[PDB]
Each structure stands twice: as C-alpha cells, then as structure tokens.
Amino acid sequence: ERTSYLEKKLSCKISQQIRLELLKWIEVKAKAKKLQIQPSQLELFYCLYEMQEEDFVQRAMDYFPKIEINLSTRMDHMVSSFCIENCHRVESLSLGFLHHLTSSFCRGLFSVLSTSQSLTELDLSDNSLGDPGMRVLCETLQHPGCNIRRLWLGRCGLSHECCFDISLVLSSNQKLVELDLSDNALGDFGIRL
Amino acid sequence: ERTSYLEKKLSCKISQQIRLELLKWIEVKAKAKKLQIQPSQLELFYCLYEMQEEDFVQRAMDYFPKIEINLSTRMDHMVSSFCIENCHRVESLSLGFLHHLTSSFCRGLFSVLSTSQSLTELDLSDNSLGDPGMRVLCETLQHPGCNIRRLWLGRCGLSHECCFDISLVLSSNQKLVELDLSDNALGDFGIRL
C-alpha cells in the first residue's frame, strides 16, 4: 500500500513467498469439489478485489471454469465487476439477486459481460429482474463483440413489454443460438412482438 | 321484381314518373338543413338499398356531401355497406356503434372504405371499438389506394397493444396526414411503439 512507512519496514522475502502461497491457496479452494460453505466464490473475489494487482488476479482467477455469484449489496456489485472485467477464461456465468436492479446500478456490471470475449453462457434465471432491468440488458447485448450464445431467463419477472427489446437484439446480434423464456407472464402480444 | 306476374300488370308510365319523383325527393330530404328526425340518413339508405339499381343509386346518392351513420344490427351493416361501396362523392364519413365489432363483421364494412377513392376523412371517435376491431382496421388501411387522410379516434376503447398495428400503417401508408388518439388509456409503452 502506497503509505510511506507501511512498505519499507516489512520484508519482501516472506511477502513474495506469501504471494505464491496465496496463489496456490486460491487454486486449492477453487479445485475443492466439496461444497465448503465458508470459502465461497464471492468471498474469494473479495480477497481478489483487494489485490488491485492486474497480472496476479489474471493468473489467480484463471482457475475459474464456472462462475456462480449471488449479490446482495451495491459493494457486492463492484467487487464482482472488478473480477469479471479481466476473467479471460470464464465459460459459464450466473448472477444471484436478493435485494440495485435500477439501470443506474446493473449497467456497470452488465457492461462487463458485453466486453468479455470468453463468455458464452449467461444464467439469469430465478431472479426478480424486471422490465427496466431487462431493458438495459438488451442495450448491452447489442454491443458488438458480445460472444454470449445461450441465455436462460426462467422465472424472471419479465412481462409482455420486455419482448420489444428482445426483438431488437435478435434483429441485430447474430450470436444468440439458444434463448429460454420459460415461466414468464407474457401474453399473445409478447409473442406477437 | 323478377316475379312473373308482378311486372306486366302494372304501368311503367307512372313508375318512370315515380322514379324521377323519388329521385327528386331524396335530394329534397338530403338538402333539408333542419334536423328532421324521421327521414334520417340511415332510413334513406334503407330505401336506397332496396333499389338494387346500380345507376340510380349512383346519381341519387351523389347529393351526399357528408355522411353520418349510426349502426345497431348486422343488417344495418350490409345496408350501409351497399351504399358506401358506390358513393363516389363522399368527403367526410363517420360511424356509430351501439351494440358486431368482431373482425368477422366489421371487416366487410371496413373493406369498403379502403376501396373508396373520394373518401378523405374518417370519424370513428366516441365508440367502443376495441383492439381486435382496431387490428382489422389497420389491415384495411394498408390496402393500396386508401385515400383516407385524417382519422379521429377519440374516446375509443383503444389500449397499448393497438399501437403496434398503427405503427405498421404509418410505416407503409404515406396518405395519413392527421392522426388523433386523444382520450385513450395507452401508457408509455404505447408511445414507445
């Protein structure tokens, strides 16, 4: 840390050894098949966000094939945003909302997905993401380079008026191959759009 | 009438004189400025529909600059349909519904308007014409040759889902110059469409 007398009284020999041990530990927890509740993926990202080191988080998070995130607070959005913005090996991604669904908040995190090349699948099912939240999602999907192929939107709070935006991304983006809208209260008008 | 012994026992001399007198009478009632309740425009069309003579109704109804019609029954739709289908001098037209709003009924009358060259104004305001009725109206408006310029749709039972059809006729027909949608319960989504 950039503090004057908090850098040069400590020893780099142990810190460098600590860095490798922490890097090794992240892989150990990431490869832990058992559902250890306390070292959750979100908790690791809290430590990873505290790194503020560009190259270290690049190699440390490269041990994340599948990402499953549940979010509760505004700070939870930025800690996750700093991770996904440089995760170049993510294949499947998901979000969990329990509360920030306004376009002034979810836009920052959703803008990350559109700029992620390795991203292929987005699982937003079983959420209360409303139409205004759905509207900003389609705005990000229209961004060129969005490599998302399959999105699951089951049990979402989507209504008929959301289908207008979804028709736009289909008419623009050619990357979507699989679309799921199961368990939505959209009528015949929604299919018409 | 094509009955055998109902043509050749009566005298054509009086009937020809009657034809001119009836033709004169229609103009007399048509030019009557006072609001004589009993010889209403609909009542005259009942007599005009009973003509079944193509050329006579052409010249007889040419004394109709403004047409104001109120309809109640299915038979009322066909008597009016037979008139408007050959009225080549109509400028302003209107309808009155009090009950046949299903597309299986109003389509026959609405198909007449699209094929009327002289027609310029359509006043459908203050009616309970719903979205399914509005949908078939936009289907007829897309027909080429529809010379309707100004339509008034105030106080109609139109909802948000009707605006999808109206956006189509605008994107296709270039004849509309004035559109009125005052007093409708369409939200921000309706304007969005």
3-state helix, strand, coil in chain B (%, to 5): 45, 10, 45
Q: What distance in Å separates the CA atoms of residue B52 and residue B44, rounded to the nearest whole number?
A: 14
Structural resolution in Å: 3.4
Secondary structure of residue A130 in the 3-state scheme: coil
CB hemisphere CA count around A68 (13 angstroms): 5
CB hemisphere CA count around A188 (13 angstroms): 4
Q: How many residues does chain B have?
A: 193
Among B134, B159, B161, pick the best mutation site for testing chain A contact (most A Cβ within 10 A).
B161
| Residues facing A71 on adjacent strands | A97
Residue A85's alpha-carbon distances to A64, A107, A117, B18, in angstroms, are 14, 13, 10, 91
Structure tokens at A47: 């430590």
Q: Chain A closest CA to B132's CA: distance in Å?
A: 12
From which experimental method does this structure derive? cryo-EM
Secondary structure of residue A183 in the 3-state scheme: coil
Pair A155, A127: CB distance under 8 Å: yes
CB hemisphere CA count around B52 (13 angstroms): 3
Angle between helices A41-49 and A74-84 (to 10 degrees): 80
Pair B81, B109: CB distance under 8 Å: yes
Q: Which residues of B touch A164 (CB under 8 A)?
A: 189, 192-193
3-state helix, strand, coil in chain A (%, to 5): 45, 10, 45
Q: What distance in Å separates the CA atoms of residue B147 and residue B115, rounded to the nearest whole number?
A: 9
Count Cβ atoms within 10 A of the Cβ of residue A14 and give its class: 0-12 exposed, 13-18 middle, 19 or more buried. Answer: exposed
Pair B42, B69: CB distance under 8 Å: yes
For A92-123, give the DSSP string.
EEE--B----SHHHHHHHHHHHHT-SS--EEE
Most distant CA pair in chain A: distance in Å?
70
Which region holds residue B126: left if phi is over 0, alpha if psi is between -120 and 50, else beta? left
A193:B161 CB<8 A: no
Which DSSP state fits A180? E
Structure tokens at A51: 């790194």
Number of C-beta neighbours around residue B157 at 10 A:
15
Pair B59, B86: CB distance under 8 Å: no
E-assigned strands of B2-139?
A: 66-68, 92-94, 121-123
A→B contacts (Cβ < 8 Å), by residue, are 161, 164, 189, 192-193
Q: What distance in Å separates the CA atoms of residue A68 and residue A92, rounded to the nearest whole number?
A: 8
CB hemisphere CA count around A105 (13 angstroms): 17
Q: Chain A closest CA to B161's CA: distance in Å?
A: 7
Phi, psi of B2 (to 5 degrees): -70, 5
